[PDB]
């Protein structure tokens, strides 16, 4: 017949939610006197859409975030000292265009992650590829590339993401001989794309957490010169914040 | 016929009896010990668990 | 707007016809009040036979067949060594199932390549894959992917394809090495896929062929274990179409 | 010999067609040397495509219907009412599936009963059955089933077709009794069978029609929970018809 | 393509063994040059040998045979008193067009029941339905059904069959007032229809069993009138001849 044979076509044209909805569809059509055009663009946008929202699962299930956090969990009462509309501004996205890197810098505990990934995810959400990784993780893995010879795959693997999510900088210090992997993804994405990193650690420990201080400040130096850093002055949320307000 | 009468009826009968009678090896009402409990204290804001979808909104607004 | 948004949905979820030929269908459809459902199975289909289409050419390009022929084409009375009923058998690709090896025999411009060429193409048209090369040309490929080291690359490819059409056989002599290459050849097609071989010297001739009377014969009891043999005997096509050309 | 037994298997075997036309698709064969496998596919093809039209002819037989008619008979020009689309649309059939009745309402000899036939008609077509009744004849046999205590049995044969056209609706005042008998005929058929019905009575007229106005109501009520109107305007076509034959 | 569709029309032609070697015959026609017609006939045929075999099979399982035995086994060594030839002459079958009945008598397990079976199965051979039941049971059977009304049922299920194998005629005997239903089954098959009959009481002792003198009388004056009687001699076969053979 014919509908056995449109399931079949749809089918193998990779069109399943068209397969599925295309006799409603066509009844609703049917009942408004609706053109052929509009029809057509019904099941072409249905189909747009639940395919970038599979797009939109596969790119979060590779971003390799530890877990999904977004803004909308977040009190900006409890952190007042860094204003809330920033945030919201960056939530536009307006520093990818600007490959501006964004940087959080506080005390343990305060939502410096929390922030990233919510941002990471927002640019997860419009499409854009977005990479998490931990700074010593990523070190790590490219001193082994390296070892085994093959850098430069993995040097693209971390310099290709548009957002690349860098945390616990300070966390580890491995030999300070692989801090120049850590430069080369640095000075590779510079001016190209845009940087999120968060640590607890101030601007003047990087030549000792990588052991070496003129590496550090040309490392910073390059972070530093297009980004909006954050410093963000409180407790740890978890235990103080808590304890604090139960009072 | 539901969850919820269901989850009801459990509570209830936890409270009146489950968490009432005294365990045949401690010898006591659960309730006393829990008063001897210190467990932590809780936080505020609980971890919020649910589903966490990112969807396109069709050109109408549907 | 609607139009160009459509192109774009098109575009996007690979569907090349219908971003040209929806207006049209559309117009159609409204000259003659089509229902959504025929309108819609009317652009899936032109869909399909195009992809089809493009598929098949794609197939016939990576075969390699240095021009298209078809059964349609041979003529038989001028050819009245074989009946039409064979061939066509042939043609309805069960030796394929039977792993059958297919074997055609005769003087030069007979016709057995014409008769191995529109099989391959046949193929190709239901699905399946076909590799045409030339007996020589394949020993050389292997003998230099052996000086490479690349020698598993080649035999790889030529082993996949699922339909092997091994041609310009017997003309050329061989040594001891191309006759071990060819023996390879047929061995890892050997009960796994069908091959058709074109030559014009006897079975027994092999041996001198291929300067081995013992890897001859060993070739030859494996590939007749799974045969079908074609001795076609008749005046050169080739010979005849000039004939009738000059007068 | 070997024709008889040909014959004597093909009607033990219950192979009609192939029993006569056997000996000229081996004449047919011979004349073109067909392969064996294409032999043997058009003489089981000739044998499916007759054993599909008997099938349809028993069908359409055992479906009661006055006459056969198709929308290609019908004219939209000269019913401008309804629109073409809504109309094919329905000849897909899918209010199968979705167990949606469907009513026809206008003037004497608009049309709303061929178009149930044409719909009767393909549905048979497409391997559905139907069964055509006059709501009449329908209430008399239900009776007559009731007082010989067979009631059971009429209605499972009145609801086991997959769709029931009541015709001739509106058109004779029903008593309560029959009331009640079309009451449980359309709460047999209550979303579990499309039901095709043509009436020239809105469907408040339905009280009066069947002398209890909450019968009515409930009736009309169970039925437009899953149903699909046809308000149809204009001249008689049997009228129009009669002038032209003047003319 | 064309082997799925010959493959689905077989199927919807009921045709299992010729959809599976439909290939093989028509590769077997092709190397051999068969004519169409043959090949046709080959189909045909197997598809015919097949099915026979299957309703051998349901003809088998509904004798209702409490096993399966055959001459095969038999060894007329141990019953000489009777003639061999004459068992092989009713293997022929030519008494189910005379009509008559077969008896066996002789003491207890002098193989009665094995030569009637034997008997049974090669009728069903060829086609003819046979049926298998005790004396009694069939009594009790029309008892049952008599007092249920369906007498007439049950008569026709046991006097439609072409052989009848009634056995233990004496093993027990039911109420003398059922004898009348023995007797209208052997009338109504009487001149109609062959019955076997195996039991080791002499004709004399009918009147006992049956509880009634006249009724036996004309029981066997009706089931005598076309029929061959044989007596076997002898003892008990599976005590008494390996008893006696074994010293
Ligand atoms: N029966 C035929 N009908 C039509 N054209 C034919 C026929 N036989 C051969 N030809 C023509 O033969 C030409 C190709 O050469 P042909 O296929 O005969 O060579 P071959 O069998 O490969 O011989 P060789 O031994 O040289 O490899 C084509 O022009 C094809 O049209
Ligand atoms: N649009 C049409 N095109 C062609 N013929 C038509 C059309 N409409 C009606 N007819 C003709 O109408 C005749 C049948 O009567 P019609 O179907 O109009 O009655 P109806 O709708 O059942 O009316 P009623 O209320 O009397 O039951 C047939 O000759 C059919 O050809
Ligand atoms: N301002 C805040 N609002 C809501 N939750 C917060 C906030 N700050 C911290 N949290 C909670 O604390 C955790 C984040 O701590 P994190 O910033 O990852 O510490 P660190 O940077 O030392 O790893 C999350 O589970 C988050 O829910
Ligand atoms: N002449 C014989 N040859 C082979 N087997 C025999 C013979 N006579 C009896 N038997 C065996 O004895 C059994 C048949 O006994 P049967 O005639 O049924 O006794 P009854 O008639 O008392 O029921 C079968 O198992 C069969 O194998
Ligand atoms: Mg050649
Ligand atoms: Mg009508």
Same mark, same amino acid.
């Given at each position: ?75 900006? %009462? ?51 590829? %977005? ?85 550090? %400040? ?30 | ?14 409270? &009146? ?13 659960? &309730? ?31």
């Amino acid at each position: 017949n014919m509908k056995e044979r449109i399931h079949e076509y749809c089918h193998r044209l990779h069109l399943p939610v068209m397969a599925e909805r295309w006799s409603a569809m066509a009844e609703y059509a049917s009942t408004h006197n609706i053109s052929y055009s509009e029809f057509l663009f019904r099941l072409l946008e249905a189909e747009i859409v639940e395919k970038q929202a599979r797009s939109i699962q596969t790119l979060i299930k590779l971003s390799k975030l530890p877990y999904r956090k977004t803004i909308d969990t977040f009190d900006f %009462t409890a952190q007042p000292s860094v204003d809330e509309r920033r945030i919201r501004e960056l939530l536009t996205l307006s520093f990818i265009d600007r490959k501006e890197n964004i940087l959080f810098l506080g005390p343990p505990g305060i939502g410096k992650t929390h922030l990233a990934i919510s941002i990471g995810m927002e640019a997860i959400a419009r499409g854009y590829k %977005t990479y998490f990784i931990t700074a010593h993780d990523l070190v790590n893995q490219l001193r082994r590339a390296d070892q085994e010879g093959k850098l430069e795959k993995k040097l693209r693997v971390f310099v290709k993401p548009t957002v690349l999510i860098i945390d616990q900088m300070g966390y580890l210090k491995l030999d300070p001989n692989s801090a120049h992997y850590l430069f080369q993804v640095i000075a590779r994405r510079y001016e190209h794309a845009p940087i999120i990193l968060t640590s607890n650690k101030s601007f003047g420990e990087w030549g000792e957490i990588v052991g070496d201080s003129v590496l550090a %400040t040309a490392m910073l130096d390059r972070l530093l010169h297009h980004s909006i850093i954050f410093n963000l002055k409180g407790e740890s949320y978890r235990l103080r914040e808590k304890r604090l307000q139960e009072e | 016929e539901s969850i919820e009468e269901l989850n009801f009826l459990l509570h209830r009968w936890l409270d &009146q009896v489950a968490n009432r009678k005294p365990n045949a090896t401690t010898g006591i009402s659960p &309730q006393e010990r829990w008063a001897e409990e210190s467990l932590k204290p809780l936080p505020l804001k609980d971890y919020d668990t649910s589903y966490l979808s990112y969807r396109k909104v069709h050109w109408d607004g549907s």
